[PDB]
Design a protein around this nucleic acid. Structure first.
Lengths: 115, 210, 177, 69
RNA sequence: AGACAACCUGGCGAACUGAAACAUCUUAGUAGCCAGAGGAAAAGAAAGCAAAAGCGAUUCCCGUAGUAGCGGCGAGCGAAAUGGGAGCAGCCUAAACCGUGAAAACGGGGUUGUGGGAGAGCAAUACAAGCGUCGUGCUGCUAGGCGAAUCAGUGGAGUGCGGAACCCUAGAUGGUGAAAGUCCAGUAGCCGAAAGCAUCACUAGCUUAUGCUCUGACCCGAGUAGCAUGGGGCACGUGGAAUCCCGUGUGAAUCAGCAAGGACCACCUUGCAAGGCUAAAUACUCCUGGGUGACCGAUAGCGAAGUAGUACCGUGAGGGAAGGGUGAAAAGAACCCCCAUCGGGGAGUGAAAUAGAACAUGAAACCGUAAGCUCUCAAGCAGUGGGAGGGGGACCAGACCCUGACCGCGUGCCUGUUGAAGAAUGAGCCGGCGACUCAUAGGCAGUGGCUUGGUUAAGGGAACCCACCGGAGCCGUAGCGA
RNA sequence: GGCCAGUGAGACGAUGGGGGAUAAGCUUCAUCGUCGAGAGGGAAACAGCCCGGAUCACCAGCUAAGGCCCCUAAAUGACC
RNA sequence: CGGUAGGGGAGCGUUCCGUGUUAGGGAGAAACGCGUGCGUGAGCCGCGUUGGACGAAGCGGAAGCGAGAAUGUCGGCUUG
């Protein structure tokens, strides 16, 4: 009742096709194709949570570098002082996006934070 | 309950011949007749399959190379099952089992199969055969006139097994004759079209009453 | 029902769990036997009743009494039949009660000993319908029930023991009124 | 085929009592009896239930005797 | 005489193992070795079981029953009787007695059991059955024979598909360029043996042979039974140890008796040891002839699909491989060129020549060649998130795929540990083979079938399965106590 | 209670002690926390220390422990 | 709604079998390779100037049923 099969080769060929552009025996050699599928997926996990964290960090330092161009000592903390006292609910650090896509509009943002 | 017409070579609607069987209860029927079927064609099986274990092949019963001082595994047999030269693990022994199924569960499986056979226009009904010169042309001609295709896999059974219908019926593939000596469930649950005679409908009501 | 549309009910046939076919299946790897020990190794393993070198459960307990002596164990010598087996039966007012009546009625189904233990009628339950019993001996309370019902009661002498002619002579000498 | 064999070394020690519970004879009786008390010698003279641990151990080591639980 | 796979009988006869050590025990009277013999062998016709009721040789199956027991009462070992089936078959011989011979023999008689036989006397004749070179008889087998019913179109070929007809006592199978009731070999059915073998039925013929009355004399298997010992084996390990068989030594009785009924004695019941022979049911396959297969498909299935127990290894006993598939048909490449061949390219065959003899589908590791992007100030389990620059086709032109300037982050996988990136283990890589399976039981759970309690086993069955029998047994109905 | 598993080598940290030399990431106990079987953040890295308990997605916001010169997110913030 | 040893529930796949001389298939089946598709995933479905005859689904059953490990093992091919 012999049971020679082919399902390991489709099982294995799917993982073989996912492991393209892995520079060498991480892209050809099955017994490393498995663990590069595995380590590639957990790399996708931690780099996804830390792409949320990392783009948060990037917008913080980008709008900090935008506000510090005034010359007078107005930090990023004081922009949030007078960004929540003057009631602006949650611009979500997308003013770090229109701070470079619309620099006159972020000058209107900050020049209305002053008043 | 529900009646059925008694046909002949002419084809009138004479007589009633009620079919009152011992049915299975609802929601319980297809598991019972599925169980009697799966032990019918499970019990039809046979052993017929063998393989040689480690204790049977003509491979060596020797230590091929000693236990240490060689960088290679501890392989102590050439007919070892890890080596494809012979010897298997846990293969099929030729097994001639006994799957017993209850009597009054199997009788109720037959009664549920024949009970579900009638009612949905799958049963027409004959009563007699007298075939001098058995020649399979009046057989397939009466088969056509009764409303049954020869290719649609019908089944039908007769009392006393007269020889001239066994002789004129055993060559068409789609049907095979039966008898209360040889009434199984798997051959009758093909259930496309199936006929009775008056001795089989009154023998069939005689046995599986109320 | 066709050959196509048959299927078993759910819960009737579970799938047999296969062991060592993946850790997502449930019993992969060590197949559900921990890490090491006699429970994981292949073979007969452990005798059931063995305490690991400790003197076992059964050895520390003294033997049951007649089984300690090798004396023959207590054994039923009759068929115990209550009157509750007789009222619930379909025995009507005119009916004999014997071995073949209680076998052929559906009360007793004796198979292993048709030859040794005849019958006995016991006391619990009532018997209002009078009968004609020719069976073996009775208890005192069942004799009070059956004679309290006004039914024909007859004890049946089963077998006669062989008494030696000097023992039958010594016992026949004892007839001194 | 192969019937299971009743373990005789525990069949002589354990017993079913109609309702279906294992009973047993208490130990320490056929040895050094003057040294004990009569209170002990009729405390150790009765048959009692076996506790649930060794009521479920020997229930599979003595298969043919009809014990529930 | 020698050979013979397995089963069978007889003799020698272990040990690893289990008992969590081990010696009693188990494994085990198994394996192995020798001898013998047949399709079966052994056993087998009561000096038997049983229990006051009864059966009637042996063997085998279901059951009692994992019960009674046995056992460092440990591990374990484990009947038998009652009951139900398969199959049935019973016969020769010694002695007492007559006759011949110095015994030893021979010829008649007799071989049985709620006793016969011998001796003496009276009757009486034929019913039935057994054995068998010999040849007419029957069927079967070892060769075979007749044997129904269609064409045409389709991309190589049609049996497939679509259109028109038929056979069927035949639609089982195998093949035919491709899958077939109608093409072939066949099949269903009807037939057929000079010769041999087998099956039961004839036959010249040999045989079995009968009943009563009296008679305790005469007989009914002697170095035997029994006993003292030493044991073996019956499930029973020397235990109260019976039955059965042997070693040494002692050593009976004939029916008014002897043996058994689990030490033994008394009574009763049962049978007649010390003489042999028998078919059947029964176990197996080196095989043979049919039919099958939820058996395999070239690492599988026999070790073996070719030289297979072969090449090869060993002095020898012995060990022991591997290598299948061009096409439908070799139609296997005429001829020309390179050229010493091997090989290659045209041409030709073919449906296919990228089907070319290393020849059928040809995957991965491995070796390459071509195209796009990109690396020579760079530290990295080789990824991933973001994505500079560039390339490709595009249609939902914002999308998709490929390359990757640079930045952040990320201690291979398994095993197995308190703790493994670990400088603990394992793996060169790729592809296959490769592990909680099977039988029979106990227990529980889930789904059923009957609750006029349930259910059959063995066995019988249109070859198997199966309808339907087959109530034997099992379980639950009553417990307590040794 | 029924059926049915593993586990019975623990480790460190605080307190209570014994052995030691109040020496050991030492040994043995008693209560507790973590790891084992726990990811993330802080601890430069780093099982057991602090915050904290990961179903998953978001190029969302507010915080605990801890930090706000640069590498590296946020104060070269204010006053003693 | 983290999870090791472990326990339970629900499913995918493979070859064979019933339906099955099934639907479909030299107008290209299985294979092998492919995806801007769908799933929690095992996987399904679809496309192939490769290949050439078998064989789905559904409703069910049975396993020599699923591979990355055994100094496994058998062939092929590397490194040096």
């Amino acid at each position: 009742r012999v049971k020679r099969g082919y399902i390991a080769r489709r099982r294995r060929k799917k993982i073989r096709f996912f492991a393209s552009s892995f520079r060498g025996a991480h892209s050809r050699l099955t017994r490393t194709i498995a663990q590069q599928k595995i380590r590639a997926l957990v790399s996708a996990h931690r780099d996804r949570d830390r792409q949320k964290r990392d783009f948060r960090r990037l917008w913080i330092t980008r709008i900090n570098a935008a506000i510090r161009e005034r010359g007078v000592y107005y930090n990023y903390s004081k922009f949030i002082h007078d960004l929540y006292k003057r009631q602006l609910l949650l611009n979500r650090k997308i003013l770090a996006q229109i701070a470079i896509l619309n620099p006159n509009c972020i000058y209107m943002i900050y020049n209305e934070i002053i008043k | 309950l529900i009646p059925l017409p008694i046909l002949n070579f002419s084809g009138e609607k004479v007589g009633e011949t009620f079919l009152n069987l011992k049915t299975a209860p609802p929601e319980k029927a297809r598991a019972v007749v599925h169980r009697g079927l799966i032990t019918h064609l499970q019990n039809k099986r046979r052993g017929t399959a063998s393989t040689l274990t480690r204790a049977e092949v003509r491979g060596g019963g020797r230590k091929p190379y000693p236990q240490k001082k060689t960088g290679r595994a501890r392989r102590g047999s050439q007919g070892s099952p890890l080596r494809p030269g012979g010897g298997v693990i846990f293969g099929p022994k030729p097994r001639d089992w006994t799957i017993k199924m209850n009597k009054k569960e199997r009788r109720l499986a037959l009664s549920t199969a024949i009970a579900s056979a009638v009612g949905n226009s799958f049963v027409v009904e004959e009563f007699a055969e007298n075939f001098e010169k058995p020649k399979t042309k009046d057989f397939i001609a009466a088969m056509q006139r009764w409303g049954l295709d020869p290719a649609e896999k019908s089944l039908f059974f007769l009392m006393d097994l007269v020889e001239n219908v066994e002789k004129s019926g055993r060559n068409i593939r789609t049907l095979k004759l039966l008898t209360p000596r040889s009434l199984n469930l798997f051959d009758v649950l093909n259930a496309e079209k199936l006929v009775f005679t008056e001795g089989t409908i009154q023998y069939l009501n005689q046995r599986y009453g109320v | 029902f066709r050959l196509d549309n048959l299927g078993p009910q759910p819960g009737s046939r579970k799938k047999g769990k296969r062991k060592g076919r993946g850790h997502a299946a449930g019993q992969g790897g060590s197949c559900g036997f921990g890490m090491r020990g006699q429970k994981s190794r292949s073979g007969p393993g452990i005798m059931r009743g063995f305490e690991g070198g400790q003197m076992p459960l059964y050895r520390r307990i003294p033997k049951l009494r007649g089984i300690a002596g090798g004396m023959r164990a207590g054994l039923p010598k009759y068929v115990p039949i209550n009157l509750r087996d007789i009222e619930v039966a379909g025995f009507k007012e005119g009916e004999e009660v014997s071995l073949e009546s209680l076998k052929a009625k559906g009360i007793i189904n004796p198979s292993g000993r048709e030859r040794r233990l005849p019958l006995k009628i016991l006391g619990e339950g009532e018997l209002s319908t009078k009968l004609q019993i020719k069976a073996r001996a009775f208890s005192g309370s069942a004799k009070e029930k059956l004679e309290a019902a006004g039914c024909s009661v007859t004890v049946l002498p089963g077998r006669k023991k062989y008494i030696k002619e000097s023992v039958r002579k010594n016992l026949a000498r004892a007839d001194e009124y | 085929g192969y019937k299971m064999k009743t373990h005789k070394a525990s069949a002589k020690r354990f017993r079913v009592t109609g309702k279906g519970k294992i009973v047993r004879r208490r130990a320490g009786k056929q040895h050094l009896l003057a040294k004990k008390n009569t209170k002990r010698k009729n405390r150790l003279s009765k048959l009692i239930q076996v506790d649930r641990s060794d009521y479920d151990n020997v229930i599979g080591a003595l298969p043919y005797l009809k014990v529930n639980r």
